[model samples]
Target: ICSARAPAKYSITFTGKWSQTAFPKQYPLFRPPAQWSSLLGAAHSSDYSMWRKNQYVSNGLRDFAERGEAWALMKEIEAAGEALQSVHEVFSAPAVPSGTGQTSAELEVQRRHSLVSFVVRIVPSPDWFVGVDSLDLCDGDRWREQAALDLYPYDAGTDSGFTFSSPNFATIPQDTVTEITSSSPSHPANSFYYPRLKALPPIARVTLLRL
Candidate 1:
């Protein structure tokens, strides 16, 4: 219904800052511009979660899940046709054993398809990651003036095992998705739980920078 006043451009940036967080820096945090692939919000969350569950990672996430690589997953995004498809590629700075960084990208969308979401990994951990579900940008007649959010990490429920440089393998349940809880409950792989079983820190920040 916004044809008469359809918007034209947008800029989305993801910034990473270290606070009271704990973990290795090699995790390579990011905010992948994910499209709404499902009609229902929970459905997409579960779908993406299941995409890495048990066998989900085997398809496209294992690289990002076990290592600090995102190439394979990017391929999936490109295939999905929802990729921002812009030149402004923003990837988190390369962290050694640990630190902070930022990444950003740009894209165009008609008012009819104004849904967006994102995902990033806690590398070395099995399908463990964080992302946004379906976020609608159409504000009745115009695009959102601006949008921002403090990112939260979510476990993909994939990799059975789980670090930074030297990651251990074969841990936890390769089943459904869940918020990362303490390690003792359902420990996986090596005892060292990155972002370990303790108070979680806001490792990153996501903001929609429209210029």
Candidate 2:
């Protein structure tokens, strides 16, 4: 049951910071336009999770990650909305024009639906994305003033191709969602693998401000 605390609204800003200067290798070969797909997400309760690391990705997530599509995922959220209490709001922000552009959207939450999750696909990649899963905004008897999440590359595990422009090569056995580290793939051909770096640079950032 929810208490009487007034519902809170937040403005979410997604800032893309990816650039060829940071990830230099193989960027010029395909030059497929560095961009991010539309930012899609929802305000939900604890019973719902959009995507999580080490867990099998949902068909909805797989579709989005592989093809920059959101209809299937939005349909999934609508199904959760059918539960009546699991979801609050479904929202979509505009696409980023380039690697360094920005976009924003708004969402609201109540004590009963205080967690938020969102995703953005890395365009032209195999099945890569960046997102947050079930971030809680309430603390004790009050909501936190603000929240910020740094976004790193994550493999959707639906495709096995490494380079940005590689043709579709489905993951034969299917796999769980996983963070892409500098050495996780451990190959010179892997887009995120940087032998000299321990962790990959954040591809984007999400900041939430209460309004």
Candidate 3:
């Protein structure tokens, strides 16, 4: 990552209005507050992916992963560094969710950090959240016209429990990261949608507009 190579100016935005179909015969819900599709990169090197499983989990991210805690996640985000720089976002002062619904945030990024990532916790679960990995926004030298993508839920792999409401902190060794396959194997009797699709839609959408 070259500081000099980084772009001059850019903006990223996240808008969210959440909804989840109740599981009458089955079950359910963070991040749909609890949410995707799947497409991105995760590298072990500190400069690349930055944040690792056991290696380095920010107090904020760890709580966000395990307990739908984004307050700390946002604070730590403001404290970005090598480990989790790929996944970053900006928030207002409070930086907390109102739960009244409809939320959004936008922030600036320099050229050096060409790639950006974002994640939000799925409440009442065992380490699940929706997020985007490293996304390259710079084209040629300028930002792209506009880029759009869907959101999906991920297991955070920090916990062993299943379902939108099961339990457990870490399995045993606490692996790096893994996406939830389904309740067929999981439990909530829920299935991995966009994660299985190919970055489709319904749950959420992210747009990168060049500024």
Candidate 4:
């Protein structure tokens, strides 16, 4: 997260790289598991499972997995909520050798409270992704402090297991799959397997802030 003084123009840029050798295939992207809908019902006490069919989820997932497109996801988010209508623009970094450069967007924080989030697929993995979950930019005095925050990875829960080069994972039918795994070249050095498909890391700690 990046912050600028009120009435001050600012540019927010996010930088990262392809953690693996390739990107995930997009076609035939699997839908959330059956249990997911049930769990959502039990948790929310309402049926929002139909949201899975919403174009936002599909297009957003495609953009994240296929092209590293966060803007599309952001657009879908804005369309879903009236509060995000103020988002001005989004940009992406050009492909480069080894690691990628920086991608950025510009926006003004006019409202006292605004939430923003989008996912980015970690290339060369089956379904690993990361993004800001729901950032609250309300406390004007603390907005700048909260703006610089660290993001964490999410599993998406849409695919199963990591694959290395042979079969195109995306072509497989949904029912044929079992559990989804976040294993990939990018798997962190410590963890045995990836976790937190729906949850995110804490943002209150000032140390988590980043560029």
Top candidate when judged by TM-score against the true structure: 2
What C-alpha lDDT, on a 0 to 100 scale, does residue 25 get in candidate 3? 24
Residue 122 deviation, candidate 1, in Å? 2.6
Scored by lDDT, model 4 comes in at: 0.35
lDDT of 2 at 197: 90
Best by lDDT: 2
RMSD of 4: 11.4
Write the residue-wise lDDT of candidate 2 on 1-211 in tens digits. 4452878889999999788887886763346687889999999998888999999889998999999888999999989988666999898899996887899999998898888999999987999999999988877668778999888999999999988888999998999999998888977799888988977788899999988
Tens-digit lDDT track for model 1 on 1-211? 4341754455666555443234433333433221111010111211223132223344455556445466666566544444433211222323223234455665444454555555666533444555555455566677776778776555555454433233354545455555654353243433234444465555556676555
Candidate 3 vs. truth: CA RMSD? 6.4
Clashing pairs in 2: none
Give one digit per residue, the lDDT tens place, for model 4 in 77-196: 445334433343232233322223345544434232233433445444455444544444434443443366554444443454443211234533332212223443234431213343
lDDT of 2: 0.88
lDDT (0 to 1) per candidate: 0.45, 0.88, 0.48, 0.35
Over 4 Å off in model 1, which ranges?
Answer: 1-4, 19-58, 82-98, 162-168, 171-173, 181-199
Tell me the spans in candidate 3 whose CA falls farther than 4 Å from its real position: 1-18, 21-59, 70-101, 182-202
Comparison by lDDT, 3 against 4, better one: 3
Total clashes in model 1, counting residue pairs 3 or more apart in sequence or in different chains: 11
Clashing pairs in 4: 1-147, 22-124, 148-209, 149-209, 161-181
